[PDB]
mmCIF file of C-alpha atoms in Angstrom:
data_model
loop_
_atom_site.group_PDB
_atom_site.id
_atom_site.type_symbol
_atom_site.label_atom_id
_atom_site.label_comp_id
_atom_site.label_asym_id
_atom_site.label_seq_id
_atom_site.Cartn_x
_atom_site.Cartn_y
_atom_site.Cartn_z
ATOM 1 C CA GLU A 1 -105.710 -66.436 -16.339
ATOM 2 C CA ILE A 2 -107.955 -65.602 -19.236
ATOM 3 C CA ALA A 3 -107.218 -69.711 -19.940
ATOM 4 C CA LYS A 4 -109.205 -70.016 -16.738
ATOM 5 C CA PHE A 5 -111.862 -67.265 -17.461
ATOM 6 C CA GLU A 6 -112.492 -69.365 -20.841
ATOM 7 C CA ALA A 7 -112.980 -72.535 -18.869
ATOM 8 C CA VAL A 8 -115.590 -70.941 -16.594
ATOM 9 C CA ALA A 9 -116.754 -69.082 -19.446
ATOM 10 C CA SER A 10 -117.824 -72.439 -21.397
ATOM 11 C CA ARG A 11 -120.042 -74.151 -18.806
ATOM 12 C CA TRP A 12 -122.679 -71.173 -19.284
ATOM 13 C CA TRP A 13 -124.935 -73.433 -20.747
ATOM 14 C CA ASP A 14 -124.743 -77.135 -18.633
ATOM 15 C CA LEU A 15 -127.992 -77.279 -16.767
ATOM 16 C CA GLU A 16 -127.417 -79.465 -14.256
ATOM 17 C CA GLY A 17 -123.660 -77.500 -13.802
ATOM 18 C CA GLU A 18 -122.131 -74.152 -11.802
ATOM 19 C CA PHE A 19 -124.515 -72.175 -13.797
ATOM 20 C CA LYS A 20 -128.006 -74.101 -12.368
ATOM 21 C CA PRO A 21 -129.187 -71.428 -10.689
ATOM 22 C CA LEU A 22 -129.226 -69.316 -13.572
ATOM 23 C CA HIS A 23 -131.042 -71.309 -15.769
ATOM 24 C CA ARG A 24 -133.357 -72.065 -12.636
ATOM 25 C CA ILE A 25 -134.285 -67.701 -12.205
ATOM 26 C CA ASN A 26 -134.987 -67.077 -15.909
ATOM 27 C CA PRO A 27 -138.009 -69.039 -16.693
ATOM 28 C CA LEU A 28 -139.502 -66.648 -13.785
ATOM 29 C CA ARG A 29 -138.089 -63.229 -15.199
ATOM 30 C CA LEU A 30 -138.891 -64.714 -18.787
ATOM 31 C CA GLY A 31 -142.781 -64.836 -17.803
ATOM 32 C CA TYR A 32 -142.980 -62.227 -16.008
ATOM 33 C CA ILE A 33 -140.914 -59.862 -19.473
ATOM 34 C CA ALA A 34 -144.312 -61.294 -21.394
ATOM 35 C CA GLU A 35 -147.048 -61.350 -18.624
ATOM 36 C CA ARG A 36 -146.062 -58.007 -18.571
ATOM 37 C CA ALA A 37 -144.858 -56.365 -22.032
ATOM 38 C CA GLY A 38 -148.482 -58.785 -23.906
ATOM 39 C CA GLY A 39 -146.601 -61.282 -25.180
ATOM 40 C CA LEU A 40 -142.516 -61.159 -27.050
ATOM 41 C CA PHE A 41 -143.564 -63.222 -30.345
ATOM 42 C CA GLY A 42 -143.338 -60.098 -32.771
ATOM 43 C CA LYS A 43 -141.385 -57.852 -30.862
ATOM 44 C CA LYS A 44 -138.157 -56.043 -31.146
ATOM 45 C CA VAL A 45 -136.126 -56.627 -28.140
ATOM 46 C CA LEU A 46 -132.362 -55.832 -26.829
ATOM 47 C CA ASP A 47 -131.251 -57.718 -23.765
ATOM 48 C CA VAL A 48 -128.540 -55.245 -21.826
ATOM 49 C CA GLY A 49 -125.579 -57.698 -20.120
ATOM 50 C CA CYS A 50 -126.592 -60.316 -21.436
ATOM 51 C CA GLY A 51 -123.876 -62.531 -20.940
ATOM 52 C CA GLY A 52 -124.012 -65.936 -22.355
ATOM 53 C CA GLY A 53 -127.351 -65.474 -23.350
ATOM 54 C CA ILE A 54 -129.746 -67.344 -21.243
ATOM 55 C CA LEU A 55 -132.631 -65.007 -21.514
ATOM 56 C CA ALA A 56 -132.103 -62.919 -24.888
ATOM 57 C CA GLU A 57 -132.397 -66.835 -26.215
ATOM 58 C CA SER A 58 -135.359 -67.614 -24.142
ATOM 59 C CA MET A 59 -137.233 -64.467 -25.469
ATOM 60 C CA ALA A 60 -136.359 -65.118 -29.130
ATOM 61 C CA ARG A 61 -137.463 -69.111 -29.184
ATOM 62 C CA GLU A 62 -140.765 -67.245 -27.627
ATOM 63 C CA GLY A 63 -140.609 -65.286 -31.529
ATOM 64 C CA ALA A 64 -138.362 -62.385 -30.146
ATOM 65 C CA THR A 65 -136.197 -60.335 -32.993
ATOM 66 C CA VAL A 66 -133.950 -60.028 -30.039
ATOM 67 C CA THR A 67 -130.345 -58.251 -30.037
ATOM 68 C CA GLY A 68 -128.048 -58.894 -27.050
ATOM 69 C CA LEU A 69 -125.324 -56.698 -25.503
ATOM 70 C CA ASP A 70 -122.769 -57.233 -23.354
ATOM 71 C CA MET A 71 -118.801 -55.560 -22.723
ATOM 72 C CA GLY A 72 -117.906 -58.847 -21.578
ATOM 73 C CA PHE A 73 -115.604 -60.696 -23.803
ATOM 74 C CA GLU A 74 -115.893 -64.210 -23.077
ATOM 75 C CA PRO A 75 -119.430 -64.634 -22.272
ATOM 76 C CA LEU A 76 -120.100 -62.728 -25.820
ATOM 77 C CA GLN A 77 -118.831 -65.637 -27.572
ATOM 78 C CA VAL A 78 -120.452 -68.428 -25.716
ATOM 79 C CA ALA A 79 -123.952 -66.713 -26.678
ATOM 80 C CA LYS A 80 -122.884 -66.491 -30.331
ATOM 81 C CA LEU A 81 -121.346 -69.763 -30.100
ATOM 82 C CA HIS A 82 -124.233 -71.397 -28.358
ATOM 83 C CA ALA A 83 -126.766 -69.812 -30.436
ATOM 84 C CA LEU A 84 -125.203 -71.275 -33.967
ATOM 85 C CA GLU A 85 -125.543 -74.530 -32.491
ATOM 86 C CA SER A 86 -129.071 -73.813 -31.426
ATOM 87 C CA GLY A 87 -130.166 -72.823 -34.727
ATOM 88 C CA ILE A 88 -131.676 -69.792 -32.855
ATOM 89 C CA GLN A 89 -130.863 -66.111 -34.542
ATOM 90 C CA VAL A 90 -130.097 -63.273 -31.978
ATOM 91 C CA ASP A 91 -127.702 -60.281 -32.783
ATOM 92 C CA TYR A 92 -124.809 -60.044 -29.648
ATOM 93 C CA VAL A 93 -122.769 -57.130 -29.662
ATOM 94 C CA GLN A 94 -120.100 -56.030 -27.523
ATOM 95 C CA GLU A 95 -120.442 -52.456 -26.550
ATOM 96 C CA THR A 96 -122.311 -50.024 -23.753
ATOM 97 C CA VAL A 97 -125.693 -49.348 -23.762
ATOM 98 C CA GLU A 98 -124.561 -45.948 -23.751
ATOM 99 C CA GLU A 99 -122.917 -46.161 -27.360
ATOM 100 C CA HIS A 100 -125.959 -48.345 -28.344
ATOM 101 C CA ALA A 101 -128.741 -46.067 -27.577
ATOM 102 C CA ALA A 102 -126.517 -43.407 -29.487
ATOM 103 C CA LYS A 103 -126.734 -45.127 -32.987
ATOM 104 C CA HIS A 104 -130.315 -46.940 -32.283
ATOM 105 C CA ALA A 105 -132.414 -44.774 -30.401
ATOM 106 C CA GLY A 106 -135.886 -45.481 -29.602
ATOM 107 C CA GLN A 107 -135.812 -48.558 -32.214
ATOM 108 C CA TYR A 108 -136.646 -51.050 -29.575
ATOM 109 C CA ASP A 109 -140.285 -52.288 -28.246
ATOM 110 C CA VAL A 110 -138.508 -53.803 -25.320
ATOM 111 C CA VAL A 111 -135.652 -53.079 -23.330
ATOM 112 C CA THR A 112 -134.524 -55.836 -20.522
ATOM 113 C CA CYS A 113 -131.411 -54.894 -18.164
ATOM 114 C CA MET A 114 -131.608 -57.905 -16.141
ATOM 115 C CA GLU A 115 -127.813 -57.926 -14.864
ATOM 116 C CA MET A 116 -125.302 -55.477 -14.546
ATOM 117 C CA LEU A 117 -126.886 -52.402 -12.868
ATOM 118 C CA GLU A 118 -125.508 -53.628 -9.674
ATOM 119 C CA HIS A 119 -121.654 -54.209 -11.171
ATOM 120 C CA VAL A 120 -121.353 -50.881 -13.103
ATOM 121 C CA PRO A 121 -119.800 -47.305 -11.977
ATOM 122 C CA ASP A 122 -123.110 -45.454 -13.271
ATOM 123 C CA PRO A 123 -126.558 -47.133 -13.176
ATOM 124 C CA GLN A 124 -128.297 -43.609 -13.779
ATOM 125 C CA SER A 125 -126.416 -43.458 -17.090
ATOM 126 C CA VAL A 126 -127.817 -47.142 -18.243
ATOM 127 C CA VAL A 127 -131.381 -46.327 -17.083
ATOM 128 C CA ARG A 128 -131.409 -43.283 -19.264
ATOM 129 C CA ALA A 129 -130.367 -45.257 -22.030
ATOM 130 C CA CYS A 130 -132.672 -47.799 -22.204
ATOM 131 C CA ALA A 131 -135.016 -45.522 -21.642
ATOM 132 C CA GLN A 132 -133.570 -43.951 -24.688
ATOM 133 C CA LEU A 133 -133.381 -46.992 -26.624
ATOM 134 C CA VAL A 134 -137.207 -48.428 -26.396
ATOM 135 C CA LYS A 135 -139.843 -47.186 -29.473
ATOM 136 C CA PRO A 136 -142.886 -44.461 -27.764
ATOM 137 C CA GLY A 137 -144.890 -46.728 -25.383
ATOM 138 C CA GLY A 138 -142.919 -49.517 -25.172
ATOM 139 C CA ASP A 139 -141.687 -51.734 -21.863
ATOM 140 C CA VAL A 140 -138.445 -50.942 -20.109
ATOM 141 C CA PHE A 141 -138.027 -54.235 -17.343
ATOM 142 C CA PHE A 142 -134.617 -53.613 -14.819
ATOM 143 C CA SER A 143 -133.656 -56.582 -12.401
ATOM 144 C CA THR A 144 -131.351 -55.966 -9.345
ATOM 145 C CA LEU A 145 -130.883 -56.585 -5.442
ATOM 146 C CA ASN A 146 -131.498 -54.527 -2.672
ATOM 147 C CA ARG A 147 -128.669 -54.580 -0.114
ATOM 148 C CA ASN A 148 -129.951 -57.622 1.435
ATOM 149 C CA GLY A 149 -130.658 -59.769 -2.215
ATOM 150 C CA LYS A 150 -127.223 -62.055 -3.722
ATOM 151 C CA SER A 151 -126.296 -61.223 -7.329
ATOM 152 C CA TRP A 152 -126.479 -65.100 -8.134
ATOM 153 C CA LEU A 153 -124.023 -64.216 -11.258
ATOM 154 C CA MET A 154 -121.478 -62.931 -9.067
ATOM 155 C CA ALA A 155 -121.853 -66.286 -6.999
ATOM 156 C CA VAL A 156 -121.556 -68.285 -10.636
ATOM 157 C CA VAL A 157 -118.175 -67.142 -11.803
ATOM 158 C CA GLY A 158 -116.813 -64.587 -8.885
ATOM 159 C CA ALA A 159 -116.313 -60.970 -8.201
ATOM 160 C CA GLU A 160 -112.240 -61.530 -10.174
ATOM 161 C CA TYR A 161 -114.686 -62.160 -12.917
ATOM 162 C CA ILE A 162 -116.854 -59.807 -13.127
ATOM 163 C CA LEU A 163 -114.568 -57.217 -12.883
ATOM 164 C CA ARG A 164 -112.740 -58.588 -15.937
ATOM 165 C CA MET A 165 -116.415 -57.744 -17.517
ATOM 166 C CA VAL A 166 -116.472 -54.322 -16.591
ATOM 167 C CA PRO A 167 -115.032 -50.562 -16.801
ATOM 168 C CA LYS A 168 -123.217 -53.765 -4.961
ATOM 169 C CA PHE A 169 -126.872 -53.703 -5.091
ATOM 170 C CA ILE A 170 -129.383 -51.081 -5.881
ATOM 171 C CA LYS A 171 -132.038 -49.340 -3.763
ATOM 172 C CA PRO A 172 -135.118 -49.803 -5.458
ATOM 173 C CA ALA A 173 -135.722 -46.013 -4.289
ATOM 174 C CA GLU A 174 -132.324 -45.238 -5.622
ATOM 175 C CA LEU A 175 -133.758 -46.855 -9.256
ATOM 176 C CA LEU A 176 -137.629 -44.914 -8.351
ATOM 177 C CA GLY A 177 -135.490 -42.062 -8.911
ATOM 178 C CA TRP A 178 -133.334 -42.586 -11.687
ATOM 179 C CA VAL A 179 -137.010 -43.911 -13.222
ATOM 180 C CA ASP A 180 -138.522 -40.645 -12.827
ATOM 181 C CA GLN A 181 -136.232 -38.514 -14.565
ATOM 182 C CA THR A 182 -136.664 -40.234 -18.053
ATOM 183 C CA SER A 183 -139.859 -40.379 -20.131
ATOM 184 C CA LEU A 184 -140.098 -44.137 -18.702
ATOM 185 C CA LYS A 185 -143.275 -45.009 -15.909
ATOM 186 C CA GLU A 186 -143.362 -47.118 -13.211
ATOM 187 C CA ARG A 187 -145.977 -49.573 -13.403
ATOM 188 C CA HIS A 188 -145.460 -52.655 -11.551
ATOM 189 C CA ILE A 189 -142.517 -54.141 -8.948
ATOM 190 C CA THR A 190 -141.970 -57.335 -7.774
ATOM 191 C CA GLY A 191 -139.424 -59.473 -5.559
ATOM 192 C CA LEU A 192 -137.439 -62.685 -6.992
ATOM 193 C CA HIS A 193 -137.842 -64.654 -3.696
ATOM 194 C CA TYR A 194 -135.381 -67.917 -2.790
ATOM 195 C CA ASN A 195 -136.188 -70.705 -0.305
ATOM 196 C CA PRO A 196 -133.152 -72.030 0.561
ATOM 197 C CA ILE A 197 -134.390 -74.850 1.952
ATOM 198 C CA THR A 198 -135.710 -76.242 -1.116
ATOM 199 C CA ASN A 199 -133.350 -74.283 -3.701
ATOM 200 C CA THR A 200 -136.936 -72.831 -5.481
ATOM 201 C CA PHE A 201 -136.890 -69.232 -6.966
ATOM 202 C CA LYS A 202 -140.547 -67.715 -6.387
ATOM 203 C CA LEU A 203 -142.237 -64.523 -7.682
ATOM 204 C CA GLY A 204 -143.732 -62.447 -4.900
ATOM 205 C CA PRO A 205 -144.093 -59.001 -2.727
ATOM 206 C CA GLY A 206 -141.782 -57.716 -1.409
ATOM 207 C CA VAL A 207 -138.159 -56.123 -2.731
ATOM 208 C CA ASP A 208 -135.934 -56.687 0.417
ATOM 209 C CA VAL A 209 -133.868 -59.432 -1.741
ATOM 210 C CA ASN A 210 -134.022 -59.182 -5.542
ATOM 211 C CA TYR A 211 -136.655 -57.566 -7.487
ATOM 212 C CA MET A 212 -137.972 -56.533 -10.969
ATOM 213 C CA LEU A 213 -139.638 -53.703 -11.905
ATOM 214 C CA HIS A 214 -141.401 -53.304 -15.033
ATOM 215 C CA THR A 215 -141.470 -49.532 -16.506
ATOM 216 C CA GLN A 216 -143.441 -47.870 -19.966
ATOM 217 C CA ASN A 217 -142.378 -45.551 -21.575
#
């Protein structure tokens, strides 16, 4: 049971295995973050819901000082282990974004929240914590799925595995409402689009499927 979850989580970084689609999606998110935030080199960055560290590590490679948060024990161990093998320094912490926000307010140039909004009982609380974590003038990114989108992480690990990692879509309008109640200002939104025929992802207008939001403090 824990054994089964450990087996699945252990394949996180096989580029040609079951986590393939997550590795294909990442360069598009990384690219959007780097473009919208004006580079990651020299920046202090928080990845909220970092899983096995696909995004976290890709940001550290471009020269950011990255912290990864996840409440899921197993994925976080896999993140630590991979960073150890790769020689990339990333600080991975098992705590809630709320806990981290209470200890580290205003410390981060960039906050990314790319995976767990649609899985947590209180997404509004996540949005408020991310806003508290970022410096004045810093960037906060969200990524989630609309009603007709797909949670690719849940596609890979399954719904049961997600529930172990937490105490199923977010309307862009809901997200905008939550953002408006904070010091964050929405700047840009884009769709993350998937072609089932060629199995390719791309960014573009239209947010009926998956989407990413750029905000600034």
